[PDB]
Paper text:
shown to play a key role in the MHC class I assembly pathway. cellular processes with broad patho-physiological implications. GSG linker and the C-terminal residues 369–417 were deleted. The long C-terminal α3 helix is kinked at Thr346.
to two different crystal forms in our study. yielded similar structures, except for their N-terminal extension. end of α3 between different molecules of the first crystal form. interactions were observed in the first crystal form. mode observed in the first crystal form.
Author numbering: 12 to 13, 18 to 202, 303 to 364
């Protein structure tokens, strides 16, 4: 009939239903398995179900395709929650947005993506939020140091990329970094990609147990903020109260 474009959304609300929407890469025969779980403590046992890394010291390669789109002349928002319930030592917690040309059964560390975004932890020296744009054959990393969350709780990560070559990074629905694409990377069409068609979780973990949930790819900042409050905002207080109840035990 005669609104925000929701290019991709995943909340894992239909039990085993997610297996049809996500594809495991067969590039290697030893990739780790994601399992559906809400972990040992949660805000809501059912709502907080997400994809959890289940095997230590493994590479992960799982991806979801969606009807392809271009962000040309549009704002692009990529958002998701990451919960390092295990008290992570070293491991990725970022997503990669690929063009539709990706063969999902062959996705691996070298697969050509458009944008990579999210937290990476590797001991005390790396607690950072990556913001990477693939530009003219190179993966260009942000020149700002954005500290990521390293506790056991669910955190919302949001990247906003605007058609005026500006961006914003939010953690828990609050701005943590912003600036211009020309200023914050060493590169007017910089922001735009002809095609996005796959969101991938392509990463390494030593201590596994991270849970990913509430993925959203949209062209509207205000909608991503509302969805953020409907997901992460609903989890927050009750999840903390449950862990506090358990810590005392
Ligand atoms: Ca969920």
């Amino acid at each position: 009939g005669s609104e925000p474009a929701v290019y991709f959304k995943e909340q894992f609300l239909d039990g085993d239903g997610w297996t049809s929407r996500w594809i495991e890469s067969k590039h290697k025969s030893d990739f780790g398995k994601f399992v559906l779980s809400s972990g040992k403590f949660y805000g809501d046992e059912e709502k907080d179900k997400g994809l959890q890394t289940s095997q230590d010291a493994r590479f992960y390669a799982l991806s979801a395709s969606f009807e392809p789109f271009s962000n040309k002349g549009q704002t692009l928002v990529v958002q998701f929650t990451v919960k390092h319930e295990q008290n992570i030592d070293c491991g990725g917690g970022y997503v990669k947005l690929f063009p539709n040309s990706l063969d999902q059964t062959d996705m691996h560390g070298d697969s050509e993506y458009n944008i990579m975004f999210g937290p990476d932890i590797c001991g005390p020296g790396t607690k950072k939020v990556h913001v990477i744009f693939n530009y003219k054959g190179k993966n260009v990393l942000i020149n700002k140091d954005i500290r990521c969350k390293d506790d056991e709780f669910t955190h919302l990560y949001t990247l906003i990329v605007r058609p005026d070559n500006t961006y914003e990074v939010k953690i828990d629905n609050s701005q943590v970094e912003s600036g211009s694409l020309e200023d914050d990377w060493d590169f007017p069409s910089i922001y735009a990609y002809d095609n996005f068609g796959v969101l991938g979780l392509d990463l390494w973990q030593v201590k596994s147990g991270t849970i990913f949930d509430n993925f959203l790819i949209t062209n509207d900042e205000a909608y991503a903020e509302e969805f953020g409050n409907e997901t992460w905002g609903v989890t927050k207080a009750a999840e903390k109260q449950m862990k506090d109840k358990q810590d005392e035990e």
